[PDB]
Amino acid sequence: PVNRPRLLTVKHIQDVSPHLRRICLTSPELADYPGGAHIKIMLPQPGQAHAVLPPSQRPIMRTFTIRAFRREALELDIDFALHGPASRFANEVKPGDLLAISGPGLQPASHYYMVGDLTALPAISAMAEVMPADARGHIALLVPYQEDVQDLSLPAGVTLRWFVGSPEETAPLVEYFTSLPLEEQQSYFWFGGEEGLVVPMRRHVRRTLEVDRTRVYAVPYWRH
Template structure:
């Protein structure tokens, strides 16, 4: 008698992807739509779903990315000259065989921004993304998605800069009708403001940086009057600012540290490469 065993499926897997379309989103972002037959297996486990995007090095057409359970160890072992560019992004939309990823354009300062500025249909990339066949997703497990207010949360604060705008957009669009939330966003230009259909209990504060090198986010959040009851904070963006705001909510606002999600994934004064080399994500 033969015994059928279930094939083990990892939460994430590598997907070969091709650029289908590129279009600007506001003043500072560009949306790249990736396609490919295999992308039908990509799913999300929450609105702020993180993925890895691997881009070709100069002179390459397709990035050569190690795969399998030990891919990261083998990736780190590659010589620098052979290692594909890897960055962390948020799935903005996932459809049948298509995935939208929004890239921040901040000039020719690093390989990811440079690629986003010249991307065109037919370009190739590799996505490390959630595989819908993973049984845990059907049970409600989350992998790489962290916006999850605990039961009984009375209000939320969502804070970020333009690098967090894709995730915050998805979070705001997922709010139930009875959500009470304060959203704070700092962006480079007036044209980066998004027009969301908001529940009545949600307010958004847009801060336009313009040419300033100083962030106004911390001051705006500190000055905000917040509701009573158990709250939840989701903080993302420049690492120094995120750490400052986390201390503010825990030490000054008295929010339980378990109710504060924070992710600082770039560092002021660092190049794109240096900022990501120092990140744990």
């Protein structure tokens, strides 16, 4: 069973940003683990010592991004957008703690248009690491604090602009992204994160432009 749930150990923790914590996880069971995919982390219910994997004892599940996966080092990285059960795991985390995770569930283009918040930053960073060096386009990020503006190495022709504001101030960013000229041929639209970012941009793209099913990734990561 190569997609089974696995119990992994926190190797080390790191705060790349004030509200972005990178937790490294390890286990010999990573050797046959199946780019930037999403997993479900499985947390114990209140009262349980640990997640009960396989029915009223089932764990609480949240969806997250595989930030990085190093098979040879038996290591898997998950970045937590600090702010629920997942947030209390991310705050109280200590090395040695258990986290159960599920199995996993970027397109070639000339133009990349992306928008996200801090819950979409790991997906964007992972995608940046394998982005084609000649890529063109624009990335817009809405962070809650000016001190979570952080460095993100990009291809030379991709633009990056930060927007500091609360999840409700989807207004400077959305205006700016609706203003920019967008290519509808040989392009990839990636919208992730909060409720009020994915959907304004997704109707913006299927209003002003004719692009196909396959080249619009608009997935709300949560709902305020």
